[PDB]
Every structure is written in structure tokens, then in C-alpha cells.
From Swiss-Prot:
Scaffold subunit of various histone acetyltransferase (HAT) complexes, such as the MOZ/MORF and HBO1 complexes, that acts as a regulator of hematopoiesis. Plays a key role in HBO1 complex by directing KAT7/HBO1 specificity towards histone H3 'Lys-14' acetylation (H3K14ac), thereby promoting erythroid differentiation. It is found in: Nucleus; Chromosome. This is Bromodomain-containing protein 1. The lineage of its organism: Eukaryota, Metazoa, Chordata, Craniata, Vertebrata. Highly expressed in testis. Component of some HBO1 complex composed of KAT7/HBO1, MEAF6, ING4 and BRD1/BRPF2. Component of the MOZ/MORF complex composed at least of ING5, KAT6A, KAT6B, MEAF6 and one of BRPF1, BRD1/BRPF2 and BRPF3. Interacts (via PHD-type zinc finger domain) with unmodified histone H3. Interacts (via PWWP domain) with dimethylated and trimethylated 'Lys-79' on histone H3. It comes from Homo sapiens. The chain holds residues 555 to 674 of 1058 of the full protein.
Length: 121
């Protein structure tokens, strides 16, 4: 059908919008603390602490696989990155501090992406 193509044209555009958004969020992590999943060889107990690990490369794989049906699902993943870090790491650590900053700085980016997704449909 033509209605399944028109969907795929939009999903593809949403994928294209969210790609831009992803790039901007990750620019707020110049230390690349959140770039890759937490190493299970280096932090073997990690899964005892964090049940849903998330990172930017894992969001990217999903994104290029058009796995985000909407902004909300994308935001959920971004929030996991931050919330996982803020649980696993104590307050006086470079990691916890890096998440606070990414949260604060990503907020502005997500604010505008909400309005753009509503605006463009
Ligand atoms: Na903690």
C-alpha cells in the first residue's frame, strides 16, 4: 500500500530528526563518558545495580534501525543514560557530575525537539 509508504516516509523523517537531536545531545558529553555501554568486563557487578543499561552507541544502533516510534521512546533512553549514572555513581564523582551537566544541557535540545515533532507532525 501507499499508506504504508507515507508512514515509512514520516518514520524516516522522524529518524532523520532524531539523528540530529542525538548528535546535539552527545556534543554535550565531550568527555565521551556516555558514548559506549558500561564495560561488563571492567564493571562485572554492573547489572546487579542497573537493570536497563543505556548509552549513546546503543541509542544510535536503535535509531538507524528506525526503532524509535516517537520522541517519548527516544527521551526514555536518554533519561536512562542519566538516571543510571546518577544511581551507580556517588554525587562527588566525575561521572555523576557529567550526567547532571548532560541533563541540564540536553533539556534545551529536547525542549525544541518537542516543539519540532509537534510542529512537523
Ligand atoms: Na547512588
Amino acid at each position: 500500500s501507499m499508506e504504508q509508504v507515507a508512514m515509512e516516509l514520516r518514520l524516516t523523517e522522524l529518524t532523520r530528526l532524531l539523528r540530529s537531536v542525538l548528535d546535539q545531545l552527545q556534543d554535550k558529553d565531550p568527555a565521551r563518558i556516555f558514548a559506549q555501554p558500561v564495560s561488563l568486563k571492567e564493571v562485572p557487578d554492573y547489572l546487579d545495580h542497573i537493570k536497563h543499561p543505556m548509552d549513546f552507541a546503543t541509542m544510535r544502533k536503535r535509531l538507524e534501525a528506525q526503532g524509535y516510534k516517537n520522541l517519548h521512546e527516544f527521551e526514555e533512553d536518554f533519561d536512562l543514560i542519566i538516571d543510571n549514572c546518577m544511581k551507580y555513581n556517588a554525587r562527588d564523582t566525575v561521572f555523576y557530575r557529567a550526567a547532571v551537566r548532560l541533563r541540564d544541557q540536553g533539556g534545551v535540545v529536547l525542549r525544541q525537539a518537542r516543539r519540532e515533532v509537534d510542529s512537523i507532525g
